[PDB]
Amino acid sequence: XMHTERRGRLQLEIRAPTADEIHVTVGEARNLIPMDPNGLSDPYVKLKLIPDPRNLTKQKTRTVKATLNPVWNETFVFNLKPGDVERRLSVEVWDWDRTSRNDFMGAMSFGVSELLKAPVDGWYKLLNQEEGEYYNVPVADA
Ligand SMILES: *Cc1c(COP(=O)(O)O)cnc(C)c1O
Ligand SMILES: [Ca+2]
Ligand SMILES: [Ca+2]
């Protein structure tokens, strides 16, 4: 109904132990799109709270070279402030490139206020970069 996957899927867990922090675990991705001449990609995940007019919240995973099915298993802490109720946690998969700019692969986002009320733990459909700033889509059940 909205869950046709065209860019792969990403496994995530997000919890807010208290209102002042969220813990984000980036698991793994499956079925990513090739964005290199070798038919592979070099994926990493960029995390930030948007809007970030001062570019101060960005964190990222390691890059996994030469794969369309990366496993990261990395956890990140965001320390939150009252202003963050207006913000969204942005999650973007990017293809690292050596000789050109990195290429966008897929994205999604979660409202901070929604994360403060309910945790995330599951697989998610990767969206285009524009959609990704506004929505997340849990994968459909079989
Ligand atoms: C839309 C969708 C379904 C069924 O979803 P409903 O909300 O029950 O209509 C099943 N699989 C995929 C991949 C879908 O996007
Ligand atoms: Ca590339
Ligand atoms: Ca690459």
Ligand SMILES: [Ca+2]
């Ligand atoms: Ca490129």
Ligand SMILES: [Co+2]
């Ligand atoms: Co659907």
